[PDB]
């Protein structure tokens, strides 16, 4: 907050200009590496109800109903293992809507094949 | 936004343009409790004073000095300081004070002073050139007078050469006015040094006795335990303010802590090092200091070849401290809330988007 | 003082943004890669080797 | 007033080990669940602390130097060690520091001090003999506070001088140990800085003789040398320093 | 006069770690190549033209 | 090895810890870069005579 300081600074011109930009461009760089990671499918797709796959058991990667989160035990594990002018800006893909794209690729790749990589 | 992207048609977007800050409102110096005052009720009005010849010096060492008590006084006729100034006394620290208290005549009051040449100044009490500090001096007829004269009040005034500046001279050695040998034998050129003054009433002004008690400071190597005091304001919690704590200051919100200090440690930092809580000196209670709720402005809008309505995110900002809703991003003030769910238009973080159809959320 | 101070505050602030650029070149380059292995391995079967 | 004591047994000087003691807090910081790295004066783990004792014939009073800080280290019972000799030539041509804790409080003074060569003081079975020093001319400091005092107490000191500031550390600890310093963990705390601004480049511990010719009650201290290193604090969630690494003792601490 | 040589001689270290830290960039990047080539030309058959 | 050097070097900070870790990150990321390259079995196979 000291203003002479500041007033000091402009004599140096646009650096805090090219910080703060680079700065930005990471910050949308990161949500756009999310969004060509996991946004790969426009259908949100479901497993059938009924989880009859001839003896394949997709328990412990398929969304857990039970958990507020909506979240596989796999991924709920994997969860739990990782733990001045300053900001934190938030991703814009929360970690539900991460979750709801895998189960998504998940209900694809199960029910359909690769098909739904393809086309319809 | 046209003036931060430098041109007059803005595309379509969320564009950070300036950086929201609380401004401080109050400004909150706690300061420790003044105690362990320095004794000048003993020095200024002491019970009887010394002579000028055998002037008592205090000491005033490792205590906290009010001068403006000393200053605002207006029984003092004269207050002439050499080296430092009046109003700053309160200001300066020193390691110590030396107080040199004695009484004169009236018209010798000058005499204490650098470069003044006189009886006292030579015989009596001789300053520096480079003296600082301040000669306080002040009328003293009521006590000092008696009607058949004052003569416990003895003055030197024959010396063979001129005083060292701050020495005393108790001697009693007779003076030889003339070249015939004295061995202490007065005769008609020898004569005793000290003589007694003439303080009547009847006297005017001039030829009273003067109390006069003249203090010097030393700017040594030691510590400065002789300070002047400190105005502590009041408390004022939860509110941006600019805080001051024993000399520790900066700028945050400083509410109530629920963390438990040991009793010899004054701040609290985190990981990071920084003060993020604190001691209170006048009343010994914990606080947190959360800083101030800075964030990025960002404009939404579409483009300026479409409409002319903006909105506002103010990040990572709650919307009670600053077409209002509020985001996990932070605050967003002009547009409109909907339950439907549309595809993302312009990106707004943690799920929200920002569309033009107004401006919805 | 106060430029000694702003200098090096500078330096160091610039020294982060490089060291930044530089991690988010190589987080981009492991995103581009799982990104073609959620188009290869995900939604296909595919015959490169490991 | 003073005594030359003339029934010592001579014997030469012990030695032990530190262990982790010495430590204590570089400032008035509070600190949570946090790990600190501090450049300051301390004491070197597993030392070559310099032991005393006060046996019976042993009556360890000698002068040493002060260097650049003091680890005073006191098993004590019945309250033989009372104070400490502060100065650099030990007589009336310098300014000296006295730290004195006799049956009612601790005064504090810097003067110009003519020390004997054997200063004690003394209890008769009553305290009733005082002889440490022999005058006191020029005084520019005093300063009269709150008393900071099988071994049934411990006792740890730092005294350090930097920028005219003397710097008391303490800490009280419960033992029941019978002859060594015992192993354990006890960061010192701040006591009271004092504005001397004075020269000390050696000390003396000040006994007390017990009287019933004398007798030496059963007594013995430690004296460390604090050295200017790097430690790694842990500080706990409530605050306190509960562990220690010297990043110069070993690779495996470095 | 230190200050003035500490300053130059941080500036050419800095620079210097900044350009290794993108020429070790570049040969990960060649070094990923190279282990894919190592997968999918060495140990299997490749239908990837050239 | 001038000791005046490094107490008013000690006054920029941290600049030389940075430094040196990110020539450890180098230093190592080359043993990486071997390592994925070359070390793709761990069967050590050996022709016939
Ligand atoms: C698929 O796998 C899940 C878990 O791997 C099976 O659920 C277990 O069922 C047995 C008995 O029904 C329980 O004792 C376990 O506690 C269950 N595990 C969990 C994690 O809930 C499930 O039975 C399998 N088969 C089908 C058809 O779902
Ligand atoms: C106790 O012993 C010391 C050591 O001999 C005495 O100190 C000496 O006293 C004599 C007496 O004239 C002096 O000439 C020496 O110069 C002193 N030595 C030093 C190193 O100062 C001390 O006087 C003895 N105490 C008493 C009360 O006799
Ligand atoms: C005498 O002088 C002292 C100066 O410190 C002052 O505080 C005190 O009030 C004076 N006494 C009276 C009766 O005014
Ligand atoms: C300091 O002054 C405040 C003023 O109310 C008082 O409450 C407090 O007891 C005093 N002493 C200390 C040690 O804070
Ligand atoms: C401590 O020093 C003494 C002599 O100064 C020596 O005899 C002794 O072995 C030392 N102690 C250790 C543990 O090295
Ligand atoms: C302090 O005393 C020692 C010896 O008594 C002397 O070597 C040193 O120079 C003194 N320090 C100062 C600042 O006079
Ligand atoms: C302890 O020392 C102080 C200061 O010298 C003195 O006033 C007091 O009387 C002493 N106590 C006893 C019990 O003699
Ligand atoms: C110190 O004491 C001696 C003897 O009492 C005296 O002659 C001398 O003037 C004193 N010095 C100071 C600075 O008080
Ligand atoms: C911290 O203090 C609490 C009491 O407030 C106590 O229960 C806890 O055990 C303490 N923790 C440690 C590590 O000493």
Redesign the pocket.
């Known amino acids: 907050d000291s203003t002479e300081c500041s007033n000091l600074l402009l004599q140096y011109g646009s650096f805090c200009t090219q910080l703060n930009r680079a700065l930005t461009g990471i910050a949308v760089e990161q949500d756009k590496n999310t969004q060509e990671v996991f946004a790969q499918v426009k259908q949100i797709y479901k497993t059938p109800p009924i989880k009859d796959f001839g003896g394949f058991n997709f328990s412990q990667i398929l969304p857990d109903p039970s958990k507020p989160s909506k979240r596989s035990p796999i991924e709920d594990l994997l969860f739990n293992k990782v733990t001045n002018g300053l900001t934190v800006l938030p991703p814009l893909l929360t970690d539900e809507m991460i979750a709801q794209y895998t189960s998504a690729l998940l209900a694809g790749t199960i029910t359909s094949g690769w098909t739904f990589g393809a086309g319809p | 936004t046209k003036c931060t992207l430098k041109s007059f048609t803005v595309e379509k977007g969320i564009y950070q343009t300036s950086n929201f800050r609380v401004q401080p409102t109050e400004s909150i110096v706690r300061f420790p409790?003044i105690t362990n005052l320095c004794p000048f009720g003993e020095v200024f009005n002491a019970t009887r004073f010394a002579s000028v010849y055998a002037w008592n010096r205090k000491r005033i060492s490792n205590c906290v000095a009010d001068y403006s008590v000393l200053y605002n006084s207006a029984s003092f006729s004269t207050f002439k300081c050499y080296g430092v100034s009046p109003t700053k006394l309160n200001d300066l620290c020193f390691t110590n004070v030396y107080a040199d208290s004695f009484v004169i005549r009236g018209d010798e009051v000058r005499q204490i002073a650098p470069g003044q040449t006189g009886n006292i100044a030579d015989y009596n009490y001789k300053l520096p050139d480079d003296f600082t500090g301040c000669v306080i001096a002040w009328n003293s007829n009521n006590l000092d007078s008696k009607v058949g004269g004052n003569y416990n009040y003895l003055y030197r005034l024959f010396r063979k050469s001129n005083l060292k500046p701050f020495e005393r001279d108790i001697s009693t050695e007779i003076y030889q006015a003339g070249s015939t040998p004295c061995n202490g034998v007065k005769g008609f050129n020898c004569y005793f040094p000290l003589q007694s003054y003439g303080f009547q009433p009847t006297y005017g002004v001039g030829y009273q006795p003067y109390r006069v008690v003249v203090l010097s400071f030393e700017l040594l190597h030691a510590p400065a335990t002789v300070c002047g005091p400190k105005k502590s304001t009041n408390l004022v919690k939860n509110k941006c303010v600019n805080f001051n704590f024993n000399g520790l200051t900066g700028t945050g919100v400083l509410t109530e802590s629920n963390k438990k200090f040991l009793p010899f440690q004054q701040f609290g930092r985190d990981i990071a090092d920084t003060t993020d809580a604190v001691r209170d000196p006048?009343?010994?209670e914990i606080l947190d200091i959360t800083p101030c709720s800075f964030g990025g402005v960002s404009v939404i809008t579409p483009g300026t070849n479409t409409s002319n309505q903006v909105a506002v995110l103010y990040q990572g900002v709650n919307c009670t401290e600053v077409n209002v809703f509020q985001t996990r991003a932070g605050c967003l003030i002009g547009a409109e809330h909907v339950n439907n769910s549309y595809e993302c238009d312009i990106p707004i973080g943690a799920g929200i988007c920002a569309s033009y159809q107004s401006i919805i959320a | 003082q106060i430029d000694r101070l702003i200098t090096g505050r500078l330096q160091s602030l610039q020294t982060y943004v490089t060291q930044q650029l530089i991690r988010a070149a190589e987080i981009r380059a492991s995103a581009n890669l799982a990104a073609t292995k959620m188009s290869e391995c995900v939604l296909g079967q595919s015959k490169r080797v490991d | 007033q003073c005594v030359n004591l003339t029934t010592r047994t001579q014997l030469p000087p012990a030695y032990t080990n530190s262990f982790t003691r010495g430590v204590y807090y570089p400032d008035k910081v509070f600190r949570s669940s946090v790990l600190h790295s501090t450049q300051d004066l301390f004491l070197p783990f597993f030392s070559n602390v310099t032991w005393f004792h006060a046996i019976h014939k042993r009556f360890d009073n000698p002068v040493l130097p002060f260097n650049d800080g003091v680890y005073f280290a006191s098993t004590e019972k019945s309250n033989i060690i009372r104070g400490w000799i502060f100065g650099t030539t030990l007589d009336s041509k310098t300014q000296s520091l006295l730290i004195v804790n006799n049956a009612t409080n601790v005064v504090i003074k810097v003067c110009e001090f003519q020390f004997c060569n054997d200063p004690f003081l003394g209890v008769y079975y009553m305290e009733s003999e005082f002889r440490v020093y022999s005058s006191a001319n020029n005084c520019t400091f005093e300063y009269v506070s709150q008393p900071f005092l099988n071994f049934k107490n411990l006792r740890e000191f730092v005294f350090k001088n930097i920028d005219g500031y003397f710097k008391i550390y303490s800490k009280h600890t419960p033992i029941n140990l019978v002859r060594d310093l015992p192993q354990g963990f006890s960061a010192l705390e701040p006591l009271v800085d004092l504005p001397i601004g004075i020269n000390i480049t050696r000390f003396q511990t000040l006994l007390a003789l017990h009287r019933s010719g004398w007798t030496a009650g059963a007594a013995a201290y430690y004296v460390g040398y604090l050295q200017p290193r790097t430690f790694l604090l842990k500080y706990n969630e409530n605050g306190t320093i509960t562990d220690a690494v010297d990043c110069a003792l070993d690779p495996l601490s470095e």
């Open positions: 409790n006048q009343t010994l």
